[PDB]
Design a protein around this ligand. Sequence first.
Ligand SMILES: Nc1ccn([C@H]2C[C@H](O)[C@@H](COP(=O)(O)NP(=O)(O)OP(=O)(O)O)O2)c(=O)n1
Ligand SMILES: [Mg+2]
Ligand SMILES: [Mg+2]
Length: 430
Amino acid sequence: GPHMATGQDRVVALVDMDCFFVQVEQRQNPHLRNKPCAVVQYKSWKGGGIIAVSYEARAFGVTRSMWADDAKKLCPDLLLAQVRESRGKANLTKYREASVEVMEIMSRFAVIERASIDEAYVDLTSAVQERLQKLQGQPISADLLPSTYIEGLPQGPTVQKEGMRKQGLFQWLDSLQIDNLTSPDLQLTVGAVIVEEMRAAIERETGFQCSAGISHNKVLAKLACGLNKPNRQTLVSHGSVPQLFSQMPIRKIRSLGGKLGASVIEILGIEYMGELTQFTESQLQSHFGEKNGSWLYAMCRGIEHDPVKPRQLPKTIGCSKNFPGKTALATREQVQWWLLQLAQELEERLTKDRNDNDRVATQLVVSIRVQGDKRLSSLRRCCALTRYDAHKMSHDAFTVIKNCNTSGIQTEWSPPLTMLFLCATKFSAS
DNA sequence: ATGGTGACGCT
DNA sequence: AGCGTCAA
Ligand SMILES: Nc1ccn([C@H]2C[C@H](O)[C@@H](COP(=O)(O)NP(=O)(O)OP(=O)(O)O)O2)c(=O)n1
Ligand SMILES: [Mg+2]
Ligand SMILES: [Mg+2]
């Protein structure tokens, strides 16, 4: 009772940009706005591979990983924007720079964790405490939460979406205890007010819309965010968790979408997150390990302790290219040419990074895949990154991989290479 | 023949 | 360290 923690100590939000690469291209090209459209890379193989899709295009069934030629069969009027190609390869710079725009705005409100190119977590616990002071006990108006859903509401004793949103928000606000500065539900609510402000700032200053989740931890904030995407935010309270989790497939929880989550389902014979409550912590540790078992025991009760890490910048800068089918690299001059291409992009990004962010990478990671290997990497080795010089980095990369060429004739390369990867790591202040 | 990314865990 | 899992 009085000693059981309820994981209600923090306010955490997750901001996730809507159809991000599409919005970047739509800002640039007004002709793409409010249209079914998608972002594609490499036009020559079936119109290119789709990597992002507008909501209008999703209505037709267009999805990521579709070939654009195939997407056109579902959506004949689909518009496309192509990823930039430089030095023979797709180049994601425009989207990385657009991501910096958003992350810098979010950082004004709170210290962020850059989770991905278009997602960031924020811990709003401190900001909420401050705002609750300025809020000298006055009630929170529904007008301060114009795009907020309260998960699980309305409930109890209208057929249009916004109507329902407002009914749920009204039930929530009506039941709030605003005189108690330590009430978790009140803290979440103030967190949601701040996130409305944050999301308004992002849209005003960039043009980009996003969704957000507000809850007490990262897993619930992330789950919350997707519940009413796009262009809306969702508050998941501690009290909403039993119902929410009672029909929530285990794979929907972040980190459980792969083999571990499948093993949870198979070994325990359950389907939904809520069903995990019926196992003891030791039982879960016995099946899934000490760390995973404790994490699951707490998570299925809505409790998670993973902190929002103060990290706004990527920890690595990588350059990757696949060489599928017949395009696999079968000559030494090919391997050398493409290592240089990659190294040149890497050098460009590294020099900009060093100027912007006052740090230098000290390790170069070189990874390849040989044709016929079942593994995604046939070799992943490091060497020193002592100079931001493309010819040196490509020469060094060649040196660390040269002995995978089993061709007696070293002019040839066998087996052919189907992937090259260069990555700069282990940053030090500069 | 999705590809181009990127963080973190294990031994 | 090198490799694996999980994720945008
Ligand atoms: N497998 C993936 C997943 C995402 N991405 C890129 C394109 C996406 O616009 C961007 C963000 O990923 P995302 O959040 O999973 N999806 P996106 O923002 O497009 O749509 P939403 O469902 O978030 O509205 O990363 C990618 O290139 N390959
Ligand atoms: Mg997104
Ligand atoms: Mg995302």
